[PDB]
């Protein structure tokens, strides 16, 4: 399945429809890709084939 989510996911009791920061976070987080990191923190480009 393919999911494109832009709203704020709620992780408490208050409705986090458009408010985030106190108990709810943005579901999308960018990758940390530094060339000075180790081998296990390098961007590997992967393709599928079924």
């Amino acid at each position, epitope marked *: 399945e393919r999911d494109i989510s*832009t709203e*704020i996911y709620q992780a408490g009791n208050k409705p986090c429809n*458009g*408010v*985030a*920061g*106190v108990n709810c976070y*943005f579901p*999308l987080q*960018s990758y940390g890709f530094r060339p000075t990191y180790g081998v296990g923190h390098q961007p590997y480009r992967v393709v599928v084939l079924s």
Partner: antibody
Amino acid sequence: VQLVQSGAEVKKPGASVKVSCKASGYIFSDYNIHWVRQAPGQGLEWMGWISPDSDDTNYAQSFQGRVTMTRDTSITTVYMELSSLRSDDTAVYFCARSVGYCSLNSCQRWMWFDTWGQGALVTVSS
Amino acid sequence: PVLTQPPSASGPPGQSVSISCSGSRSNIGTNFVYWYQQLPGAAPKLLIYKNDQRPSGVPERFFGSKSGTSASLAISGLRSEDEVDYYCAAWDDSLSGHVFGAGTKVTVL
């Protein structure tokens, strides 16, 4: 690092200014240049950002064809054409060296402008 | 549109001065808000990024926070270099463009 550029004097409206924020002191393959003018008194008006690898540029929803950004590789500068200048946006232009490279419109959440070069006083009147 | 800021949130030295950065529903509340520093008649610079940490060379005394609809920046103590301007910047999905502050000037008493 430094972001030195040329300076344009006052001119009659109905022309095109030309400045070039030179990318010096760093390799120009991993940064982006964001353009914003600082009007005296009121707030800031942000234009857009460019891409080194490509002209992949995003424009603001207020100005579309009145401002155009193009780049070059050997000289490693940026060229602007500001057609149809008006006498209501007399402001100085800043180029900022921001970390992070993105091409999508849903990227602006984790990058910021580190170093701001000195501006080129540009203003509109006859 | 533009963010809402007080015109001049001044404060006498010897205590703390608080400045607010209130925007809209989609402006501040779902995206991380920023704070910038500008010298009078000079190029601006970053002041807080990501509302929790500061770059090198920035004093530890300076601190910022967020609530859900507005941003708060807390400073304490004013000197001859503390009359500089403070701007607050944010971003939104509705306009797809960076929106800065309105301009706040602080002076000693």
